[PDB]
Design a protein around this ligand. Structure first.
Ligand SMILES: [K+]
Ligand SMILES: [K+]
Ligand SMILES: [K+]
Ligand SMILES: [K+]
Ligand SMILES: [K+]
Ligand SMILES: [K+]
Ligand SMILES: [K+]
Ligand SMILES: [K+]
Ligand SMILES: [K+]
Ligand SMILES: [Mg+2]
Ligand SMILES: [Mg+2]
Ligand SMILES: [Mg+2]
Ligand SMILES: [Mg+2]
Ligand SMILES: [Mg+2]
Ligand SMILES: [Mg+2]
Ligand SMILES: [Mg+2]
Ligand SMILES: [Mg+2]
Ligand SMILES: [Mg+2]
Ligand SMILES: [Mg+2]
Ligand SMILES: [Mg+2]
Ligand SMILES: [Zn+2]
Lengths: 147, 59, 38, 206, 174
RNA sequence: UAAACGCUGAAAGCAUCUAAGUGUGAAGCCCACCUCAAGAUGAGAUUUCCCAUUUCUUUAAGAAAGUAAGACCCCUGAGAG
RNA sequence: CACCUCGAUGUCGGCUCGUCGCAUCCUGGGGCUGUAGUCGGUCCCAAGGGUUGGGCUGUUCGCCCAUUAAAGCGGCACGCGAGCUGGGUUCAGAACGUCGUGAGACAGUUCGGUCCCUAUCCGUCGCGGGCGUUGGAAAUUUGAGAGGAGCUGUCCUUAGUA
C-alpha cells in the first residue's frame, strides 16, 4: 500500500538532553549519545532525514578510560605532508582538550555522510559541570541503565 | 519497521527482541509494517500490544 | 645489564623479579649478573 | 618595547675604536597608541599602535572614528604589540625612538622585497644541471618524486612567486638613536624595500 | 609473619585523627598525613592500632601490608623522625650547610648547591659527614639519594658520597 | 617520557624501583623560536562607520529602486607584477 | 614458480630532486666491562640533524690520495629517461683471437653508431574570480590546524688539577 510513515524536515521536534560523563567509559557514553543524535530512540526515525535530539555532554574531563587506555590509546593524524604523522594519547586529550576526545569518539560512530556530519553538529561537549545552553531548557538524560 | 518498533518498545520498557518473543507467545500475528504504523501514529494501541507481550512473557 | 631472551640466575645470590611487566634478574653480589628479558 | 618605522635606507657608521659597521636607518615618527586590548574585552593583552600620519582624503569615516579616541590624525600603518605592560600605555599616548637606547638587542620584522615569478634555482637555491656534455637540463626543478605514490608529495618545491614574505631578523644591535630626527640606526641589514614598514621590538631571545 | 596483621603502637603522646581518607598523625616532631586506602580497616586502641583486610586475595594482602607499613612510618617519623647519614670521601671533598642550603665541593669545577624542603634539614657535623634529618621517611630518602647521586661512589678508589655504612665493592684497578 | 637509576613499600616478617604511592632522566616527544593560518561551512573576537528610506504585492526571510557608510570601473604609477 | 604486462610496463651507471625504514656511521642518554686516566669493547634507548673532494675505471663495487664528528645500511618499478645524459650493454659497418668446409658465430674483444611527444585529468608550486561566513562596510586580531628550523669542530680556562 506504500503507507509507511516518513518524517519531514522541520515537523519533528528535537529536544535537548544533558548527559553527565562522570566515570562513564568513553565508548559507551559515545554509543548512547550517537543513537540519540541519530534519533534511533524515537519511533519517527527516518534514515534519510534528521530526527535526533541535541545533546549537551558535561564533565567531559571526568570520562572514564578503562585499562591502560589513558596512556596507550593513541590518536593519530596525518598532515598529508611526508612524515607528517602526529600522535596524542587519549589521556593527554582528556586532560587538556576533552571536548575533542568526546567529539572524535562520537564522530567515529555517526555515519560518514552529509546527514551524519549535520547530526554531529548537534553535539555539545563541555569539560566541567556548567554549560551556556540553559536557554534551550535541556533535561537530564540518565544513562546508567543504557550503558 | 524493526528500528521504529525497537524505539517504541524501548519507550514502553521493552526491547524489540523481547517484544516480538512476547507477541509470538501471545499469538499476535500483526506484522512489522503494521506494528511500526501503530508505533508512529497510534501510540495507545501500541502500548496495549506491548502490555499483552509483557503479560505473555511473565507467564 | 645483559638484555637477552633467556634470563636465568647465574649465582645463588641472583634474584628473579618482574618490573613493569619485564622479567629481571637482580644480583646484589655481582653486577655482571644484572639481566633483563628483551 | 616596540615601535613602527619606515626603512629609510642603508649606510655605514664609525664606532668608537674606529671600527666601521653597516647600519640601516629606520625613521619612526612618534607612534600613537590607538587602542588597548585586554582579557576582559578581547581575551588577550596587547596595544594597537598607529604610525605615519595619513592625509584625511585618504581615510574613511570608520577609520577616522577609530582614531578619534586617541585624538590624532589618521595613521597609515596599524599593528598590535603583545608582551608589553598595559599599565604603561593608554589610548593617545605617544611612543618615540627614545624608547630604545644604543646597544639594545632587538628583533626587526619587515616584508621581503618581492622578486615575482622565479624559478626553482633562484627561489630555493637548488642545483643547476650540467650546462654542456649534451645536457638538456639546466634550470629545472629536478625529479618530482618516486613512481610508487602515483602522485607528487607536498612541499615538492617548484617555481612560483618569490619574496614579499614576513621575515624577522633576530638580535640586531641598536647602534644609535636620534630623537630629534626620530631615527634608529640598526647594525646590519633588515628585510624590506625602502619606505616599507619596519617593526622594531626588544629581542625575545634576550 | 605478616606486616599487615602486625599491630602498631603509639609511644610518647602521638595523636592520630581519622577521616574518610587522609589519616593524620601528630606528635613532637610534627604532623603527617597520607590518603590511606578505603579497603583496609584501621582499629584504634588507646596506644595500639591494628589493620584488618576484608579477605585474603592477592590485592588485599598487598594493600594491607603497604598501608600498615605506611602508617607505621608516619608514626615513627612523627615520634623520632628519620635521618640519612652520608659520608663523603675524597682528597678535597667537603660539605657545608648555610641554613637550608647545602654546598658540596666534591671535585667538580663548580660546587654543588642543594636545598632542603621545609620538612627536612641538614646537619653537617663535620666537613665530610652530612646528615639529612626530616620527618617523612620518603622525603628523607629522596634527599639523601639526590645528595649521594651528586657524586656516587666509584669502585677503584672509593671516592664519592656514600650512605654511612653502605657496602661499596672496590675493584683493583691497575 | 625512552633506556637507566631511584625513594618509600608489601605481596613474601626478610629482600624488593611497583602493586598502591613518589622522583631523576636524551640532540628524541609537547612547548619554547620563525612563518602560514577562521572556506577552522565549528566560517571566531575587538574597534570604528552607515541608519531604519521609497513603490507594489501580502503577511511574503515578498519584489524592485533610489541611496547612506563603503568599494570598484576608468586614469597616473611602483617599493608590486 | 610463471600470476599482470609481448595491439611495448625502457634496461646499467651518472645528474636533478628527494622521501621513508632503523638492524645507528657521527652527535645525545645509559648498563656492564678483563672500565685507573686518556682511549676503548659490548649492549640498551635514540631516526632531530648531519653524514666529502678527488685519481682509476661506462661502471655499481673496489683500491688509492687527502680530509671529516661522521664519511651508516637499506626501501621507494635494484625511486627518479613524457625530468636530463647515453659512457656500458642488444641493430645495421669494420677488425683481432677463437669455432665452422661455409654462410656465419661467441666459449671473447676493439673502433663507430638517430633518446620523439604543444600536459586533457589527478597530483605539485604559485596567483586570481565567485559565493559563503545571515544588515551593509573599514581596519585590527585570537589560533583549531600546518610548515619551517633542528648539525657540529677546534681552542682557552677549570688544571698539568682528579
Ligand atoms: K570569518
Ligand atoms: K612485453
Ligand atoms: K658505553
Ligand atoms: K636521526
Ligand atoms: K671518475
Ligand atoms: K635513499
Ligand atoms: K630519454
Ligand atoms: K611515464
Ligand atoms: K585522471
Ligand atoms: Mg645463554
Ligand atoms: Mg653542483
Ligand atoms: Mg594512491
Ligand atoms: Mg600452471
Ligand atoms: Mg596498449
Ligand atoms: Mg633501536
Ligand atoms: Mg631504477
Ligand atoms: Mg618517468
Ligand atoms: Mg678455419
Ligand atoms: Mg656469452
Ligand atoms: Mg666519428
Ligand atoms: Zn649473581
Amino acid at each position: 500500500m506504500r503507507t509507511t510513515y516518513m518524517a519531514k524536515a522541520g515537523e519533528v521536534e528535537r529536544k535537548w538532553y544533558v548527559v553527565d560523563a562522570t566515570d562513564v567509559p568513553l565508548g559507551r557514553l559515545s554509543a548512547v549519545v550517537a543513537s540519540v543524535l541519530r534519533g534511533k530512540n524515537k519511533p519517527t526515525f527516518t534514515p534519510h532525514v534528521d530526527t535526533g535530539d541535541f545533546v549537551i555532554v558535561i564533565n567531559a574531563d571526568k570520562v572514564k578510560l578503562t585499562g591502560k587506555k589513558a596512556t596507550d590509546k593513541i590518536y593519530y593524524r596525518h598532515s598529508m605532508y611526508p612524515g607528517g604523522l602526529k600522535s596524542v594519547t587519549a589521556g593527554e586529550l582528556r586532560d587538556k582538550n576533552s571536548r575533542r576526545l568526546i567529539e572524535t569518539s562520537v564522530k567515529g560512530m555517526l555515519p560518514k555522510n552529509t546527514l551524519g556530519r549535520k547530526q554531529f553538529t548537534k553535539l555539545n561537549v563541555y569539560g566541567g559541570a556548567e554549560h551556556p545552553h540553559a536557554a534551550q531548557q535541556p533535561e537530564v538524560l540518565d544513562i546508567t541503565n543504557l550503558i | 519497521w524493526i528500528a521504529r518498533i525497537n524505539a517504541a518498545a524501548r519507550m514502553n520498557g521493552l526491547s524489540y527482541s523481547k517484544l516480538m518473543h512476547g507477541l509470538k507467545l501471545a499469538e499476535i500475528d500483526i506484522n512489522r509494517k503494521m506494528l511500526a504504523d501503530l508505533a508512529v501514529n497510534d501510540a495507545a494501541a501500541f502500548t496495549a500490544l506491548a502490555e499483552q507481550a509483557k503479560d505473555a512473557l511473565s507467564k | 645489564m645483559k638484555v637477552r631472551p633467556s634470563v636465568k640466575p647465574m649465582c645463588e645470590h641472583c634474584k628473579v623479579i618482574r618490573r613493569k611487566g619485564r622479567v629481571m634478574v637482580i644480583c646484589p653480589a655481582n653486577p655482571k649478573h644484572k639481566q633483563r628479558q628483551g | 618595547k616596540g615601535i613602527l618605522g619606515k626603512k629609510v635606507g642603508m649606510t655605514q657608521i664609525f664606532t668608537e675604536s674606529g671600527e666601521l659597521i653597516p647600519v640601516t636607518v629606520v625613521e619612526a615618527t612618534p607612534n600613537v597608541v590607538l587602542q588597548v586590548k585586554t582579557v576582559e574585552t578581547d581575551g588577550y593583552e596587547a596595544i594597537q599602535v598607529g604610525y605615519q600620519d595619513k592625509r584625511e582624503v585618504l581615510s574613511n569615516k570608520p577609520a577616522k572614528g577609530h582614531v578619534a579616541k586617541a585624538n590624532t590624525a589618521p595613521k597609515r600603518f596599524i599593528k598590535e604589540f603583545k608582551n608589553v605592560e598595559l599599565g604603561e600605555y593608554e589610548v593617545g599616548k605617544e611612543i618615540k625612538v627614545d624608547v630604545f637606547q644604543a646597544g639594545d638587542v632587538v628583533d626587526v620584522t619587515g616584508t621581503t622585497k618581492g622578486k615575482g615569478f622565479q624559478g626553482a634555482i633562484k627561489r630555493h637555491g637548488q642545483s643547476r644541471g650540467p650546462m654542456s656534455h649534451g645536457s638538456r637540463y639546466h634550470r629545472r626543478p629536478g625529479s618530482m618524486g618516486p613512481v610508487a605514490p602515483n602522485r607528487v608529495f607536498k612541499n615538492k618545491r617548484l617555481a612560483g612567486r618569490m619574496g614579499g614574505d614576513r621575515v624577522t631578523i633576530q638580535n640586531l644591535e641598536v647602534v644609535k638613536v636620534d630623537v630629534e630626527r626620530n631615527v634608529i640606526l640598526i647594525k646590519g641589514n633588515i628585510p624590506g624595500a625602502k619606505k616599507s614598514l619596519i617593526t622594531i621590538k626588544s629581542a625575545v631571545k634576550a | 609473619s605478616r606486616i599487615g596483621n602486625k599491630v602498631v603502637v603509639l609511644p610518647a603522646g602521638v595523636e592520630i585523627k581519622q577521616d574518610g581518607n587522609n589519616i593524620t598523625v601528630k606528635g613532637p616532631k610534627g604532623e603527617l598525613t597520607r590518603e590511606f586506602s578505603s579497603d583496609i580497616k584501621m582499629n584504634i586502641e588507646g596506644n595500639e592500632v591494628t589493620f584488618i583486610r576484608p579477605n585474603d586475595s592477592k590485592e588485599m594482602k598487598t594493600i594491607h601490608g603497604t598501608t600498615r607499613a605506611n602508617f607505621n612510618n608516619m608514626v615513627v617519623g612523627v615520634s623520632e623522625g628519620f635521618q640519612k647519614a652520608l659520608e663523603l670521601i675524597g682528597v678535597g671533598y667537603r660539605a657545608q650547610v648555610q641554613g637550608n642550603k647545602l654546598t658540596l665541593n666534591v671535585g667538580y669545577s663548580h660546587p654543588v648547591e642543594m636545598t632542603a624542603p621545609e620538612g627536612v634539614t641538614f646537619e653537617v657535623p663535620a666537613n665530610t659527614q652530612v646528615i639529612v634529618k626530616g620527618i617523612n621517611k620518603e622525603v628523607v630518602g629522596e634527599l639523601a639519594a639526590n645528595i649521594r647521586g651528586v657524586r656516587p661512589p666509584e669502585p677503584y678508589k672509593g671516592k664519592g658520597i656514600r650512605y654511612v655504612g653502605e657496602f661499596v665493592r672496590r675493584k683493583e684497578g691497575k
